[PDB]
């Protein structure tokens, strides 16, 4: 069922923000646990956040904060780890708009993920990866940049398969910092082949790229790799 929070994210058009608290509440009454204070003050951040880039027309941003909220209270009881995953980035986001150093940012990180069970040589490899990326910036490409690290590696037995999504959009980052936009797009949608994963993938990229450069601005060589990180994996999902 995780594949519908990837399939609203991808469905582009206040409209957002009250669709997205109508989703995780939602969630809450379809998982049937009550919300703990720690789940009902990370939603309040993440909802504070994507009024944020609502006021200041990030439409991309937004509703990728309204994503990762209804798969952390998805996660909350059938894979604990991940929903640390959700909302270590959630608190790097909060931190690093309130002008926090990448060290404290990245330690405070290392907390949240040890409390949810996740083992501690996998926090300091995860920490290890993630300050080599982030050293290369937003606070939106440095919380998701480090926490899309922490996740290849928690990854180890449970969808092995989903790793190589994450270490592909990791080396096509890594490539495309250099690359142009249009010269991204086509870096992207090569790793897309190199992977395979189907065609209507290939498709459903050009489609989100289209439709972000006909209306609005143009988006960065991050974001097209961001956009290609969600159609592989809703692929993967409905392969399944
Ligand atoms: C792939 C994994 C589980 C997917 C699922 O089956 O629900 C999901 C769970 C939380 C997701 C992460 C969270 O949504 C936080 C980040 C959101 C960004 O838009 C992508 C990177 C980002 C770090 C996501 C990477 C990946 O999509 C994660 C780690």
């Known amino acids: 069922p995780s594949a519908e ?16 608290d109508k989703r995780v509440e939602a ?10 204070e720690e789940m ?22 937004l ?7 209804a798969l952390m209270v998805w996660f909350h009881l059938r894979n604990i780890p991940l929903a640390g995953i959700a909302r270590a980035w959630l608190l790097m986001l909060a931190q690093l708009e309130a002008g926090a150093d990448v060290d404290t940012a990245l330690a405070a990180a290392a907390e949240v993920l040890r409390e949810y069970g996740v083992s ?29 690290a922490a996740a290849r590696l928690l990854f180890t037995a449970r ?8 270490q592909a959009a990791l080396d096509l980052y890594n490539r495309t910092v250099d690359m142009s936009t249009e010269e991204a797009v086509e870096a992207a949608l090569e790793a897309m082949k190199e992977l395979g994963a189907s065609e209507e993938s290939l498709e459903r990229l050009k489609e989100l790229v289209e439709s972000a450069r006909k209306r609005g601005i143009e988006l960065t060589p991050f974001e097209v790799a961001l956009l ?13």
């Open 5 to 20: 929070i990837f399939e609203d994210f991808l469905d582009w058009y206040e409209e957002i923000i009250e669709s997205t």
């Open 27 to 36: 969630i809450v009454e379809e998982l049937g646990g009550e919300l703990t």
């Open 40 to 61: 009902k003050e990370a939603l309040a951040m993440a909802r504070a956040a994507m009024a944020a880039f609502e006021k200041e027309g990030d439409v991309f941003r």
């Open 63 to 69: 509703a990728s904060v309204g994503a990762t909220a």
């Open 120 to 148: 501690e040589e996998l926090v300091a490899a995860a920490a290890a990866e993630a300050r080599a990326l982030v050293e290369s910036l937003t606070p939106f490409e440095l919380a998701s940049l480090a926490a899309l």
């Open 159 to 166: 969808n092995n398969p989903l790793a190589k999504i994450i």
């Open 228 to 240: 290609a990180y969600y159609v592989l994996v809703l692929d993967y999902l409905k392969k399944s």
